[PDB]
Enzyme design. Structure first.
Site, PDB file in Angstrom:
ATOM      1  N   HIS A 168     -26.129  91.013 -20.581  1.00 34.80           N
ATOM      2  CA  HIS A 168     -26.187  90.707 -19.238  1.00 34.80           C
ATOM      3  C   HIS A 168     -24.490  91.249 -18.813  1.00 34.80           C
ATOM      4  O   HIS A 168     -23.574  90.602 -19.144  1.00 34.80           O
ATOM      5  CB  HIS A 168     -25.837  89.008 -18.950  1.00 34.80           C
ATOM      6  CG  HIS A 168     -25.718  88.702 -17.530  1.00 34.80           C
ATOM      7  ND1 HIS A 168     -26.749  87.773 -16.888  1.00 34.80           N
ATOM      8  CD2 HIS A 168     -25.080  89.280 -16.330  1.00 34.80           C
ATOM      9  CE1 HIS A 168     -26.269  87.555 -15.723  1.00 34.80           C
ATOM     10  NE2 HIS A 168     -25.352  88.553 -15.363  1.00 34.80           N
ATOM     11  N   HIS A 228     -22.060  93.737 -15.771  1.00 38.95           N
ATOM     12  CA  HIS A 228     -21.800  94.332 -14.342  1.00 38.95           C
ATOM     13  C   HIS A 228     -20.901  95.364 -14.524  1.00 38.95           C
ATOM     14  O   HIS A 228     -19.709  95.189 -15.173  1.00 38.95           O
ATOM     15  CB  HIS A 228     -21.291  93.267 -13.159  1.00 38.95           C
ATOM     16  CG  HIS A 228     -22.339  92.199 -13.068  1.00 38.95           C
ATOM     17  ND1 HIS A 228     -23.098  92.375 -11.852  1.00 38.95           N
ATOM     18  CD2 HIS A 228     -22.449  91.126 -13.757  1.00 38.95           C
ATOM     19  CE1 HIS A 228     -23.900  91.120 -12.001  1.00 38.95           C
ATOM     20  NE2 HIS A 228     -23.578  90.391 -13.108  1.00 38.95           N
ATOM     21  N   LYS A 251     -34.270  91.664 -12.132  1.00 37.85           N
ATOM     22  CA  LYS A 251     -33.296  90.303 -11.914  1.00 37.85           C
ATOM     23  C   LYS A 251     -33.552  89.569 -10.533  1.00 37.85           C
ATOM     24  O   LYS A 251     -33.662  90.237  -9.434  1.00 37.85           O
ATOM     25  CB  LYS A 251     -32.028  90.817 -12.214  1.00 37.85           C
ATOM     26  CG  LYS A 251     -30.797  89.946 -11.527  1.00 37.85           C
ATOM     27  CD  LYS A 251     -30.677  88.754 -12.596  1.00 37.85           C
ATOM     28  CE  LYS A 251     -29.480  87.867 -12.801  1.00 37.85           C
ATOM     29  NZ  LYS A 251     -28.513  89.289 -12.239  1.00 37.85           N
ATOM     30  N   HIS A 254     -31.049  84.222 -12.093  1.00 30.60           N
ATOM     31  CA  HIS A 254     -29.752  83.528 -11.816  1.00 30.60           C
ATOM     32  C   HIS A 254     -30.287  82.138 -11.341  1.00 30.60           C
ATOM     33  O   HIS A 254     -30.796  82.202 -10.046  1.00 30.60           O
ATOM     34  CB  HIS A 254     -29.112  84.296 -10.684  1.00 30.60           C
ATOM     35  CG  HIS A 254     -27.744  83.558 -10.271  1.00 30.60           C
ATOM     36  ND1 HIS A 254     -26.640  83.836 -10.556  1.00 30.60           N
ATOM     37  CD2 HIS A 254     -27.765  82.264  -9.837  1.00 30.60           C
ATOM     38  CE1 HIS A 254     -25.674  83.194 -10.184  1.00 30.60           C
ATOM     39  NE2 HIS A 254     -26.124  81.865  -9.568  1.00 30.60           N
ATOM     40  N   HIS A 256     -26.762  83.345 -17.973  1.00 27.62           N
ATOM     41  CA  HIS A 256     -25.364  82.503 -17.904  1.00 27.62           C
ATOM     42  C   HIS A 256     -25.780  80.966 -17.714  1.00 27.62           C
ATOM     43  O   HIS A 256     -25.252  80.517 -16.553  1.00 27.62           O
ATOM     44  CB  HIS A 256     -24.398  83.109 -16.942  1.00 27.62           C
ATOM     45  CG  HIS A 256     -25.092  83.424 -15.609  1.00 27.62           C
ATOM     46  ND1 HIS A 256     -25.784  82.566 -14.917  1.00 27.62           N
ATOM     47  CD2 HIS A 256     -24.785  84.599 -14.735  1.00 27.62           C
ATOM     48  CE1 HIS A 256     -26.200  82.986 -13.845  1.00 27.62           C
ATOM     49  NE2 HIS A 256     -25.578  84.291 -13.540  1.00 27.62           N
ATOM     50  N   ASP A 295     -21.843  88.482 -18.887  1.00 23.85           N
ATOM     51  CA  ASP A 295     -21.479  88.443 -17.481  1.00 23.85           C
ATOM     52  C   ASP A 295     -20.348  88.972 -17.006  1.00 23.85           C
ATOM     53  O   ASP A 295     -19.783  88.496 -16.057  1.00 23.85           O
ATOM     54  CB  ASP A 295     -22.135  87.107 -16.965  1.00 23.85           C
ATOM     55  CG  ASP A 295     -22.144  87.295 -15.365  1.00 23.85           C
ATOM     56  OD1 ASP A 295     -22.416  88.248 -14.638  1.00 23.85           O
ATOM     57  OD2 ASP A 295     -22.183  85.970 -14.928  1.00 23.85           O
TER      58      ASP A 295
END
Ligand SMILES: NC(=O)N[C@@H](CC(=O)O)C(=O)O
Ligand SMILES: NC(=O)N[C@@H](CC(=O)O)C(=O)O
Ligand SMILES: O=C(O)c1cc(=O)[nH]c(=O)[nH]1
Ligand SMILES: [Zn+2]
Ligand SMILES: [Zn+2]
Ligand SMILES: [Zn+2]
Ligand SMILES: [Zn+2]
Lengths: 339, 343
Positions: free
Chosen positions: A13, A15, A99, A132, A170, A243
């Site tokens: 996970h 970004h 996602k 999410h 998460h 995350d």
């Protein structure tokens, strides 16, 4: 003088952003992780193979020469998304997963029904769904958004797409901990270092700490305790997903701070500490390097790495073309370090 | 363009800081309020009659010419405070009240209280001279969830304390919970409370949803909507033991928007209008005036103001910032378009 030797881990996970930010941050991941699931929440978002392909390229461009890092791209699900857009990119080895972002401001999913078809195609082709798990009704108390998602969306979803493989990204609550723990072999979860290391008190007592502000929101210690228990248990259906979600300093430290912790530099060691603390080092490697690949049906990394229990220190900040980047645990002292 | 004329209000809970900051902020209060309860949490705290006198002077110095404003001083309670010092100040009209901040065991004796029992002697002299006790009702134990601090104060400190000092007059400052609301509502004539505009206008969602907003970050922390609702009901009910206490607590912009933002809303400039807006929405305008200019005076045994002020229901925009010597101050609702404004 303890040294922990583990199979190279992966980040399920992440970004990476884009542009300059991307160039700056990738190396923190690449220098350590074999692979990483790269999120699609760019602006605009990555909803086409073509976009996913280019992005993947920009990513490789920034990977230092030495590192054997492989970005696993994802598709940003949208109400209108052509299920054939998905197969393709999936068939071509572009998309590893898709996602589901609940609609907030932007292009996330209005509803499950709006995307039913897409979801079916994913169930069919065996493409995992990354979720999410948060409701967004304005009148829903923020600390309750996760639990709420379970009953109103997760379960129903699962009950209707029986062979759907789902990663509950998460997780931050006891609710979610228990649900996953009692789920089927087709349901898994990721857990960040922040949600295991702190609780809402760490973010609001003695001052408001934007660097600890992320989504889903840090919860009550009760919740943090459930998470740590979950990992320390050996549960094989939970794995490393940082995350890591970098934001320039002034976007974090402002009148309306952005959500996200830039934890790529300190995650692994932070996770190590947690496990140690929990008296569970024996389950550490799996969390970091086995569970994910297994859920994803990917092979484990064939290389290794070492962690040394040498109290190492964290940079106050990291330079950006403009402004700085404040790392997670900035200025602090970590117990475990990657040698 | 509805007009709302009320007797000149008072602010029963205010932070004026000191030095330069004090010079910039005073005028926002003095222009409107007749009197204000001035908090003693300076660095170092106001724990002496003598520091109080000098602080009161500095305040007066900063009041603009026209303004008829009277600062009502308070003493910061500390383990080492000499009860006669407290009595003297009260007897000489220096200290209007005393303030009790949450006890920390790590607290230096000259900066705080380690426990209530430790300050029994002081309290007893207050009960005895009839000095009101202002309480910031939170238990600060690390093991306690920030959101549970107020409620836990009720059961662990408040009740008991009131139980040991039956004649003591107490103000439960800036209540933020239904817990507190119910407690106060069902209490005796010796128990009152103050409510800030932020606690009536918002809930934690406003502070955390869509981004973290340090300008809405204050102590006690914004609670869940049910709590916000409980407060609104309380003021709207007509209960006469709740009154205006802004808790205006200014910090420089840079100290608010940092890696560790200070708690506190600079609401002096816009509090009054905000309160009116709340009472209106609750269809409780008939209780507005009492809340602002009668309840507090009655509780403190002070006269109700002789002059009037007027709020006009004409749309106004709040400044984005207010200049300080070396930074700026962001007011409550900065940049927003506000419904009720002073005329
Ligand atoms: N909209 C926001 O910015 N914050 C809150 C508002 C609220 O709940 O009152 C939310 O729920 O989303
Ligand atoms: N989690 C966060 O706090 N922020 C993430 C978004 C996400 O993980 O949902 C980001 O992209 O900034
Ligand atoms: O003086 C302050 O800053 C004030 C103190 C306090 O108790 N509440 C708050 O939010 N700030
Ligand atoms: Zn997310
Ligand atoms: Zn994310
Ligand atoms: Zn207070
Ligand atoms: Zn205060």
């Amino acid at each position: 003088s303890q040294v922990l030797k583990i199979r190279r881990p992966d980040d399920w996970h992440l970004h990476l952003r884009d542009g300059d930010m991307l160039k700056t941050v990738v190396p923190y991941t690449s220098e350590i992780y074999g692979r990483a699931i790269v999120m699609p929440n760019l602006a605009p978002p990555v909803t086409t193979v073509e976009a996913a392909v280019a992005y993947r390229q920009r990513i490789l461009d920034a990977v230092p020469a030495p590192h054997d890092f492989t970005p696993l791209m994802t598709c940003y699900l949208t109400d209108s998304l052509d299920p054939n857009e998905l197969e393709r990119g999936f068939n071509e080895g572009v998309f590893t997963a898709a996602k589901l972002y609940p609609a907030n401001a932007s292009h996330g999913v209005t509803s499950v029904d709006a995307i039913m078809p897409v979801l079916e195609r994913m169930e069919k082709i065996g493409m995992p769904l990354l979720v999410h798990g948060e409701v967004t009704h304005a009148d829903i108390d923020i600390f309750d958004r996760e639990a709420r998602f379970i009953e109103s969306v997760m379960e129903p979803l699962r009950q209707r797409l029986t062979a759907l493989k789902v990663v509950f990204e998460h997780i931050t609550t006891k609710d979610a901990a228990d649900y996953v723990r009692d789920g089927n072999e087709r349901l898994a979860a990721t857990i960040t270092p922040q949600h295991l290391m702190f609780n809402r008190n760490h973010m609001l007592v003695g001052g408001v700490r934007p660097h600890l502000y992320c989504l889903p929101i840090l919860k009550r210690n009760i919740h943090q305790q459930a998470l740590r228990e979950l990992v320390a248990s050996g549960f094989q259906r939970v794995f490393l997903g940082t995350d890591s979600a970098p934001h320039a300093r002034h976007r974090k430290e402002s009148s309306c701070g952005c959500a996200g912790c830039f934890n790529a530099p300190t995650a692994l060691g932070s996770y190590a500490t947690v496990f140690e603390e929990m008296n569970a080092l024996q389950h550490f490697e799996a969390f970091c390097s086995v569970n994910g690949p297994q859920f994803y049906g990917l092979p484990v990394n064939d290389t290794f790495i070492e962690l040394v229990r040498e109290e190492q220190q964290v940079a106050e900040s990291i330079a950006l073309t403009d402004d700085t980047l404040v790392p997670f645990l900035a200025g602090e002292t970590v117990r475990w370090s990657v040698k």
